[PDB]
């Protein structure tokens, strides 16, 4: 059975992606090899069973793959929180900036989430963290408090040290792999 | 335990939505309700029990949250269909037309499919057809068999008459719930 370094060593890094100058960190092998894909949601799962989750949220859009396996592993439901335009209904919005892209706008459904959930925030990759941080955002306005969000990242560049910048508004990051 | 019934009556339908015109059928409290996902996707799992799967095959990006949960379900990897410009390394293009979009490019990296596959062609909503019928040709182009693509949508609106269109290349077509 494959372990999460089997897993690990199934990433491609591609050089000069989505531009030069960007080493693209490419995840997909792990997806498409069942027994990798196991491995991780494994390792997930395995990090937050005494963890009493209402609700995964996962970021448009790499973050929806493991992110629904992960909440209907956990036994819970899948929120999705995505880019400006796509949701129907009362939302609540918070723009930001990515290692590949300024002036990004994020969006969840007001109802999806509130102060009684205890959210499992997931995205595939943490770089800068600008994403999560404007994810982090996104659940307080929508109600969920400070002490209630959990962060999981499949895959952490430490290099860029965006668990400090997020470290500034959550501290329970778990990342599966650490570059 | 809820129903696919169930599930149904918690589809949202929202009107003038993205664009006046439309009537946007909201299915995200599904995914939002544990029992709800659950119900889904036991009704997608227990559909292809007797189907030799080897790879599901979800389309960006709504695709890719019952997609991944039905893949890691069944036990076989899982393909990223994305729009273009996203993927890295050698892919398989195909431009095509939605309900409320023209000029989409969808994209599949060459490597993670071919003529041994048997594919497992998932996406959440069946409107016109547009989308899954360019992404039967993608898979085509990538080496799958015609005779190996299954596919499979969360709701299908009846109305628009996706099925007979998708049906020129496929007719393996099941959907777990209907307008
Ligand atoms: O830590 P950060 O610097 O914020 O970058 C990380 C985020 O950027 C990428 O998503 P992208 O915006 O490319 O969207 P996608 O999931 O549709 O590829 C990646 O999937 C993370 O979500
Ligand atoms: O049968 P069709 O007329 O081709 O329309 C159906 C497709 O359109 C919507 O996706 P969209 O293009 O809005 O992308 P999204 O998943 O990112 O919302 C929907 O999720 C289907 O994939
Ligand atoms: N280097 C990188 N690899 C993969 N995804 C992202 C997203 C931001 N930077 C990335
Ligand atoms: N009416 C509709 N509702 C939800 N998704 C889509 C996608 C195309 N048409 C749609
Ligand atoms: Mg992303
Ligand atoms: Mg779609």
Excluded: W
């Excluded at 002490?147 to 990242?153: F, L, S």
């Amino acid at each position: 059975t494959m372990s999460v370094a089997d897993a690990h060593a199934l990433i491609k890094t591609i050089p000069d992606f989505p531009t030069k100058g960007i080493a693209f960190k490419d995840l997909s092998d792990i997806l498409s090899t069942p027994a990798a894909l196991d491995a991780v949601r494994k390792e997930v799962t395995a990090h937050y069973k005494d963890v009493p989750i209402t609700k995964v949220v996962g970021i448009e859009s790499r973050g929806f793959i493991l992110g629904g396996i992960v909440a209907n592993s956990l036994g819970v439901g899948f929120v999705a929180l995505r880019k400006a335009g796509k949701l129907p209904g009362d939302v609540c919005k918070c723009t930001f900036d990515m290692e590949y892209q300024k002036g990004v706008t994020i969006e969840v459904q007001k109802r999806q989430l509130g102060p009684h959930d205890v959210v499992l925030l997931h995205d595939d990759v943490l770089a800068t963290g600008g994403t999560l941080l404007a994810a982090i955002e996104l659940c307080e306005t929508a109600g969920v408090k400070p002490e209630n969000i959990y962060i999981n990242v499949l895959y952490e560049i430490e290099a860029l040290k965006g668990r400090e910048k997020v470290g500034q508004k959550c501290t329970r990051l778990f990342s599966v792999i650490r570059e």
